[PDB]
mmCIF file of all heavy atoms in Angstrom:
data_model
loop_
_atom_site.group_PDB
_atom_site.id
_atom_site.type_symbol
_atom_site.label_atom_id
_atom_site.label_comp_id
_atom_site.label_asym_id
_atom_site.label_seq_id
_atom_site.Cartn_x
_atom_site.Cartn_y
_atom_site.Cartn_z
ATOM 1 N N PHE A 35 -4.375 6.502 -10.864
ATOM 2 C CA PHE A 35 -3.629 7.209 -11.867
ATOM 3 C C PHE A 35 -4.079 6.721 -13.239
ATOM 4 O O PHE A 35 -4.407 7.536 -14.114
ATOM 5 C CB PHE A 35 -2.147 6.946 -11.687
ATOM 6 C CG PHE A 35 -1.350 7.880 -12.589
ATOM 7 C CD1 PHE A 35 -1.252 9.273 -12.263
ATOM 8 C CD2 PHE A 35 -0.728 7.363 -13.736
ATOM 9 C CE1 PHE A 35 -0.487 10.087 -13.070
ATOM 10 C CE2 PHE A 35 0.049 8.231 -14.540
ATOM 11 C CZ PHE A 35 0.135 9.583 -14.218
ATOM 12 N N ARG A 38 -6.898 8.221 -15.228
ATOM 13 C CA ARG A 38 -6.650 9.657 -15.528
ATOM 14 C C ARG A 38 -5.586 9.861 -16.615
ATOM 15 O O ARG A 38 -4.479 10.247 -16.294
ATOM 16 C CB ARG A 38 -6.249 10.402 -14.245
ATOM 17 C CG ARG A 38 -6.258 11.902 -14.528
ATOM 18 C CD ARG A 38 -6.038 12.683 -13.218
ATOM 19 N NE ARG A 38 -4.881 13.565 -13.333
ATOM 20 C CZ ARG A 38 -3.635 13.102 -13.162
ATOM 21 N NH1 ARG A 38 -3.466 11.841 -12.959
ATOM 22 N NH2 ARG A 38 -2.622 13.912 -13.298
ATOM 23 N N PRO A 39 -5.949 9.597 -17.830
ATOM 24 C CA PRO A 39 -4.998 9.763 -19.020
ATOM 25 C C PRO A 39 -4.410 11.176 -19.061
ATOM 26 O O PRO A 39 -5.067 12.162 -18.781
ATOM 27 C CB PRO A 39 -5.861 9.538 -20.216
ATOM 28 C CG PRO A 39 -7.041 8.729 -19.734
ATOM 29 C CD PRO A 39 -7.280 9.139 -18.281
ATOM 30 N N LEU A 40 -3.127 11.215 -19.389
ATOM 31 C CA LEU A 40 -2.404 12.559 -19.445
ATOM 32 C C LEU A 40 -2.825 13.320 -20.699
ATOM 33 O O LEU A 40 -3.162 12.675 -21.734
ATOM 34 C CB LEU A 40 -0.873 12.352 -19.430
ATOM 35 C CG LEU A 40 -0.481 11.027 -20.040
ATOM 36 C CD1 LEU A 40 -1.019 10.947 -21.461
ATOM 37 C CD2 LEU A 40 1.036 10.951 -20.100
ATOM 38 N N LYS A 41 -2.856 14.630 -20.556
ATOM 39 C CA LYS A 41 -3.226 15.598 -21.648
ATOM 40 C C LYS A 41 -3.427 14.888 -22.965
ATOM 41 O O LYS A 41 -2.421 14.639 -23.687
ATOM 42 C CB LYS A 41 -2.112 16.624 -21.742
ATOM 43 C CG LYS A 41 -2.470 17.834 -20.826
ATOM 44 C CD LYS A 41 -2.500 17.378 -19.366
ATOM 45 C CE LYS A 41 -2.590 18.560 -18.441
ATOM 46 N NZ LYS A 41 -1.260 18.888 -17.909
ATOM 47 N N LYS A 42 -4.660 14.570 -23.293
ATOM 48 C CA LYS A 42 -4.963 13.967 -24.565
ATOM 49 C C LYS A 42 -4.177 14.609 -25.736
ATOM 50 O O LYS A 42 -3.569 15.619 -25.529
ATOM 51 C CB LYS A 42 -6.476 14.044 -24.898
ATOM 52 C CG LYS A 42 -6.863 15.560 -24.765
ATOM 53 C CD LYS A 42 -8.316 15.728 -25.304
ATOM 54 C CE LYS A 42 -8.266 16.116 -26.781
ATOM 55 N NZ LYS A 42 -9.609 15.886 -27.410
ATOM 56 N N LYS A 43 -4.194 13.915 -26.868
ATOM 57 C CA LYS A 43 -3.406 14.475 -27.985
ATOM 58 C C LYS A 43 -4.214 15.547 -28.720
ATOM 59 O O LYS A 43 -5.313 15.884 -28.283
ATOM 60 C CB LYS A 43 -3.103 13.333 -28.984
ATOM 61 C CG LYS A 43 -4.398 12.848 -29.651
ATOM 62 C CD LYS A 43 -4.136 11.548 -30.418
ATOM 63 C CE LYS A 43 -3.000 11.816 -31.458
ATOM 64 N NZ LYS A 43 -3.185 10.882 -32.631
#
Side-chain angles (χ1 to χ4, degrees):
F35 191 73
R38 188 172 124 278
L40 30 57
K41 271 60 173 260
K42 52 170 267 164
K43 69 192 302 208

